[PDB]
Structure 1
Amino acid sequence: SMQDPIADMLTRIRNGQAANKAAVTMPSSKLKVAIANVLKEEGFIEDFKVEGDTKPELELTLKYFQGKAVVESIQRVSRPGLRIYKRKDELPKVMAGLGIAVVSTSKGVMTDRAARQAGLGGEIICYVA
């Protein structure tokens, strides 16, 4: 049943944009926060609110612009059936670099343009555009 919480997360983001919701909540993970603390920093969400003691629940705030949405695309690169590990030179450019690609390297979670300036590759999670 539960084969990924990450692909659960991005689709809950994806279906919440079209549903025009302001708050998408889900149970939280350590890796989930490490991604959610990028897109606020990268300016694709407005707020995330990690709460919950017995079980942490991540509650998001969707960023909307001129009525319509901000997240024009949200994907998954390394799926659980097929993992993706690209070096620092094979880091992509989402929408010719205008979008961002979330990569997890040994130095935590960052974006690809930071990882190029970090000069070290790793596991590409998803594409956000």
Structure 2
Amino acid sequence: VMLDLLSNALTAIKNAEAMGKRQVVIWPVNKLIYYTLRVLQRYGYVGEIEYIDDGRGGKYVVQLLGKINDIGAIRPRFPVKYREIVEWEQKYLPARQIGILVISTSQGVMSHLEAKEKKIGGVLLAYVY
């Protein structure tokens, strides 16, 4: 039974990227998938995110750029405080300069860098590098 769409979508990108594919279709989808992919596209890990309209919720077709070394959703969605994000930073990322985390804060979904500048924490979503 399908339970979490974000982990399903993020693993599809990992599978399709490892085969050197140009694009990947994603279905089903929610707003959390879209707002995460916007953060990914903002950091150059993902090309254009086209949207398709079916009766069954909708789809996204994402152009991959070979910019992903690894990707995945952090489970469970752990609460994190602002002073703690450094600790979670070194858990999922290589090097202090490389890679980002996707956090779902009360101001919206942002990268962990944009959360550190705003001085807020939230619920962890994913990691990319």
Q: Percent identity?
A: 28
What is aligned with 1:71?
68
Q: What is residue 87 of structure 1 aligned with on the other side? A: 81
Q: Which residue of 1 aligns with 2:8?
A: 8
From 46, 55, 58, give the equivalent of 1:56: 58
Q: Distance in 2 between matches of 1:102 and 1:44?
A: 13
Post-superposition Cα deviations, 1:31-54, rounded to whole Å, max 9, x if no partner, equal 111011111111101111122142
Aligned equivalent of 1:67: none
SS of 2:51's equivalent in the other structure is strand
Find runs of 4+ consecutive structure 1 residues off by over 3 angstroms: none
Gaps of 5+ in 1: 65-69
1:85 counterpart letter in structure 2:
P
**1 CA distance for matches of 2:14 and 2:63?**
13
How far residue 5 of structure 1 moved from its aligned partner, in angstroms, is: 0.5
Q: What RMSD over aligned residues (CA atoms) do the two structures have, in Å?
A: 1.3
Deviation, 1:76, is: 2.1
Higher helix share: 2
TM-score, structure 2 as length reference? 0.87
State the partner residue of 1:112. Answer: 112
Q: Specify every segment of 5 or more residues in structure 2 that has no aligned partner in the other structure, as ranges.
A: none
Q: Does 1:103 pair with 2:100?
A: no
- The alignment partner of 1:43 has SS state of coil
How far apart are residue 20 of structure 1 and its match?
1.2
Q: Secondary structure at the match of 1:35?
A: helix
TM-score by length of 1: 0.87
Deviations 1:49-102 (A, max 9, x none): 1221422111100112xxxxx20011221x2xx330110111125322410000
